[PDB]
Amino acid sequence: SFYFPGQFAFS
Amino acid sequence: VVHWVSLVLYCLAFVLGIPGNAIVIWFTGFKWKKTVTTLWFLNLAIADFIFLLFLPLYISYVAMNFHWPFGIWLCKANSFTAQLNMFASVFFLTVISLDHYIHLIHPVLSHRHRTLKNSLIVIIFIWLLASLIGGPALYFRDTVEFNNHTLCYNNFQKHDPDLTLIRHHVLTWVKFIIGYLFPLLTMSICYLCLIFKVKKRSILISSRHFWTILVVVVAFVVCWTPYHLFSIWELTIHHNSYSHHVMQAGIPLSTGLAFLNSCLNPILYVLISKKFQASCTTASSSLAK
Amino acid sequence: TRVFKKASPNGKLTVYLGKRDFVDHIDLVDPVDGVVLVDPEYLKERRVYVTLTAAFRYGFRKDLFVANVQSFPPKPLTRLQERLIKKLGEHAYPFTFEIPPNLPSSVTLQPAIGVDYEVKAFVAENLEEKIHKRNSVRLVIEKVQYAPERPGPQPTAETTRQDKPLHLEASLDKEIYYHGEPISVNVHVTNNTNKTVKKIKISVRQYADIVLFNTAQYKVPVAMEEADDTVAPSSTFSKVYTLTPFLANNREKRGLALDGKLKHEDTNLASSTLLREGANREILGIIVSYKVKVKLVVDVAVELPFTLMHPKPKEEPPHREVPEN
Amino acid sequence: DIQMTQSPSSLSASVGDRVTITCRASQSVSSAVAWYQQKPGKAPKLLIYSASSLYSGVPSRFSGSRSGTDFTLTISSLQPEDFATYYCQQYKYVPVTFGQGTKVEVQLVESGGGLVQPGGSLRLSCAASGFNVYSSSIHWVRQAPGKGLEWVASISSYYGYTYYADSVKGRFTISADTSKNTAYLQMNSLRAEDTAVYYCARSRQFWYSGLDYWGQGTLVTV
Amino acid sequence: VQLQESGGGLVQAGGSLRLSCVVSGFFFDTVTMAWYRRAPGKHRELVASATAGGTTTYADSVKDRFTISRDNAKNTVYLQMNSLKPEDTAVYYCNTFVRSLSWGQGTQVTV
Secondary structure: OOOOOOOOOOO | OHHHHHHHHHHHHHHHHHHHHHHHHHHHOOOOOOOHHHHHHHHHHHHHHHHHHOHHHHHHHHHOOOOOOOOOOHHHHHHHHHHHHHHHHHHHHHHHHHHHHHHHOOOOOOOOOOOHHHHHHHHHHHHHHHHHHHHHHHHOOOOOOEOOEOOOOOOOOOOOOOOOOOHHHHHHHHHHHHHHHOHHHHHHHHHHHHHHHHHHHOOOOOOOOOOOHHHHHHHHHHHHHHHHHHHHHHHHHHOOOOOOOOOOOOHHHHHHHHHHHHOOHHHHOOOOOOOOOOOOOOEEEOOOO | OOEEEEEOOOOOOEEEEOOOOEEEOOOOEOOEOOEEEOOOOOOOOOEEEEEEEEEOOOOOOOEEEEEEEEOOOOOOOOHHHHHHHHHHOOOEEEOOEOOOOOOOOOEEEOOOEEEEEEEEEEEEOOOOOOOOOOOOOOEEEOEEOOOOOOOOOOOEEEEOOOOOOOEEEEEEOOOEEEOOOOEEEEOOEEEOOOOOOOOEEEEEEEEEOOEOOOEOOEOOEEEEEEEOOOOOOOEEEOOEEEEOOOOOOOOOOOOOEEEOOOOOOOOOEOOOOOOOOOOOOOOOOOOEEEEEEEEEOOOEOOEEEEEEEOOOOOOOOOOOOOOEO | OOOEEEOOOEEOOOOOOOEEEEEEEOOOOOOOEEEEEEOOOOOEEEEEOOOOOEOEOEOOOEEEEOOOOOOEEEEOOOOHHHOOEEEEEEOOEOOOEEOOOEEEOOOEEEEOOOEOOOOOEEEEEEEEOOOOOOOEEEEEEEEOOOOOEEEEEEEEOOOOEEEEOOOOOOOEEEEEEOOOOEEEEEEEOOOHHHOEEEEEEEEEOOOOOOEEEOOOOOOEEO | OOOEOOOOOEOOOOOOOOEEEEOOOOOOOOOOEEEEEEOOOOOEEEOOOOOOOOOOOOOOOOOOOEEEEEEOOOOEEEEEEOOOOOOOOEEEEEEEOOOOOOOOOOEEEEO
16 A cells, blocks of 8 residues: 555664 | 654664774783684674664664665665674674583583684684575665655565565565574573573572673563564554554664664673783602601 | 602691502502691691592582591501601691592593592681682692503404395404503404495594583594405405504594693593493593494494503602603 | 712722712702613613612612712622613703713614714614504613713604704704604714714603613714 | 801801891791701701790700791891700701791701
C-alpha cells in the first residue's frame, strides 16, 4: 500500500 | 523532542566510546606486549572503532528529517561498514564467551590448543565470514527521493526482473538468525552453564574473576533484541495492512541503544581487576658424618 | 653430606632438607624428613607450622594432598634429623611427612603446567591468617619413580584384518627401556591377500591419561620412522627397525609431558608411571604411558606397550643441567 | 671463569706411603669435581666422579674429601703402577677447567690428524662403539705438549645442544652421526697454538658424572 | 650481602681483639645474627646470640669469655675477645643466627 522503505536503520 | 533524546544519547555514546576505544587499543598490544585474549580484545576494539567511525554521519542523518546530503553512493559504503562492524562485534563477543568457557571449565586442552597461529586463522575466518555476510546485504543498496527524504532504500520492493519479492522475509530471517540464534542462545547457555558449573567446583572466588558475567549478557540482549523485534514488526507490517506512521521513532533510540553497548565494551571487559598504570636462592650446608 | 637448605626473604625461618628427590616406590613413599631453624625471637607467642601441598598448577591451583604438622609446642627422629639437631643446636624443630601411596608423580607439560610439590613453613597463631610471601619459604621437591630390577615380559601383538587376512605380528627386544636407549621392533609380515602394502608407519606415542575434571586420553607422537617397503601377495617380509625417542625433535610439539622441573631448565621425556594392579583410576594427576604402533597402509596396526624410565641413581639426580649456562 | 689450582706441582715419594694432592677451586662450586689419572703416552682415566664417590673398577686405595672448596685426593699406599699425572676437573659450568697437573715421582677410535699448514682446515672423526649417541655426551679435549688438558667442544644429541670454548668459538664445529655412532669435529683457521693431542671422550648424557671413557690420540701439528 | 669483616691477627695470649662485622645490603632490624667459628679440620659451631634486645647466650665452652654487642646505627656487629686459650684459634664467620646469609670468607685468628 504505502510502500514504506523499511530502512529507518542501517542494513 | 522524540529525536532529541536519541540525538543526545547517541552523542553521549560517542563520548563514552571514542576515548574508551582509543584508551583500550593503545594498550591492547602493550599489556604484557601480547596475548590471544588481548589480541581478540584488540580486534573487537577495531570493530567498535570503525563501527563508530561512520557513526557521526548516521547520527547527523537520524536527527534532522532523516535526509541524506551525502550523495547516493555513500549509502552503500556506510551501510556496509555499519553492518560489518556490528556483526564483527557480536561475533567477537561470542568468541570471547567461548574462550571464557574453554579457559574456565576443564582448562586442560586449552594449553595445547591456545596457539597464536590458531588465533590468527580463526580471526581471518571470522573476518571473511563477516565480509561474505555483509556483501549481498550491502551490494543491494540504493536510495529513493521522497520530498528531500533521500533515505537509503536498498531494494525493499522489486530490485530487478531477475529478483522477486521473496527476499523481503528471508534477507531478514537469516539476519534474525545471525542476531538471535547464534549470539543470544550461545551466550545465554554458556553463561548459565559456566555460572552453575563453578558453584560445584568452588573456583568462583567472588569480586574479581566474577560479577562481570551477569552485566555483559543482560546489556547485550536488551540492546540487541529491539532491532530484531523491529525487523519482525516490519515483516508483520508487510502483511495485514499498514499500521500507520506510529512507532518507528524509537528505532533511532534502539539503534542508539545499540550504540550504547558499543561504548560499554571498552569500559568493562578490559577496565576491571588487573591494572598497571591505573625469594632467596637455594644453597647448601656442610654436615658432620 | 652437603644437606640442602633455603632461606626466606626475611632473615629467619631457614628450612633444611637432605635431598630434593624422594623415590616413589610402588607400595610406599619415602618420608619427607628434615628440620626447620628459627631464632628464639619473633616466636614469643606465635606457632610454627610446616605444610606439604600437592598441587596441579595449570595457569588456578588445584590441590591434591594437604598435610600439616605442628613443630614447636610438641614419633622417633631419623638419623638425618638427629645429625641436623646436633649441628643446628637446640632451636631446631624437626618435621616429618608421610605421602600416601598412588599419588601422581612430579611431572609437567612442556609449554608452568603440571604437578608440583611444595614445602611451606608458617609463623602464625593458627592456620586462619593471610600470611605474606616474605615470611615463608616455597621449596619445590620431587616424587619420582625408577625402573624395577625385574624385567617384564616381552610385548607381543597380532592383528588379522584384511585367503589369510594380512597376518601381522610385532615384538620388542625387552619390556624395560631407559631414556636414550634405542628401541628395536619386529615387523614380521606374511601377506596372503591380493592387496599389497605401500607404506609401513612405525611411531612411538606418549599417552597422557590425565584427569582434572573429566578423563582424557591425549595422543602425542614422539618419534616417526617412514618405511618404503612393499610386499607381494603370498610373500614373506621381516626386518627390524630402530627407534630412539628424544626431546630435540619434540621441542616444537605442545602439550608434551616432561619430567618435573625445579626451575625453568629443560628435562627429558616424562617417565612412564607404573601403578599397582587394580586400585582406583580417578587419580587427579598426570599419567604417562608409552607404546609403539606398527601400521601397514594398503590399514592394519598393532599396539606394543612398554615402559620408559630411569635406572636407580647412585647418589642423587642433579635436578639441573650439570654444565649449566 | 673458574681457575683450578693444585698445590703440589711435582711430588716425589716411595712405595708404601700416604700421599695427598690438594685442589683449590676459584669459585664456590658444589661436590661436582672429578679426578683423573693419566699415564704418560696414554689417555686419562677417571678415578673419582663426585669428589666422594669411587669409580667402578679402580682400587679402593683412592679416596676423596670436600670441605668448603678444598677438594683433595688421598692415596693410602703408592703401588709401583701409580706414578702418573693427576688432574683436578670441575663440571658445574660449561667452561670446564682441568687442574694444572700433579706429577708423582666400549671402544672409542679417533681418525685423521696430521701436518696442516696454518690457515687450513682439518676434520677429525671419532668412531664410537658400545653405546648410543643419544644416551651419552661426546666431549673433545686437547692436551698441548707439556701442558694440561683443555676443553674444546661438546655435543648433547638428546637436547640438541652444542657448546664451544671461548678460544675455538666459531672456528670449530662439532657434529654427531647417529646412524654411524660417530662424532665429528671440524677444525678451521688453524693457528700456531692449536698444536695439541686431541682426545675424543664420552660422558653419560643423563646426570653427568665425568668422562668415563677416553680415546687414544690424533695429535695435530701445524 | 657482601659480609666484609676484619680484626684478626697474631695474638700470643690474653689479648683484646674487638672483631667487627658489617653487613651491606641487608638491614638488621629484629633479625638475630650470631658468630660462628670453624676449627682447622672441624666444622662450624655457635659463639653467641646477639639478638635485637640485650639477652646474650654463649656456648658452654665460652662462658664469661666473649662479649658481643650490635649497634644498628652503622649496621655493624662487634665482638670482644679476652683471655685467649690456645684452643680458641679458628676462622670466625659472621652472619644471621638462622644462617640465611651467604658464607663469606672469615677472619683467621691464632693464639
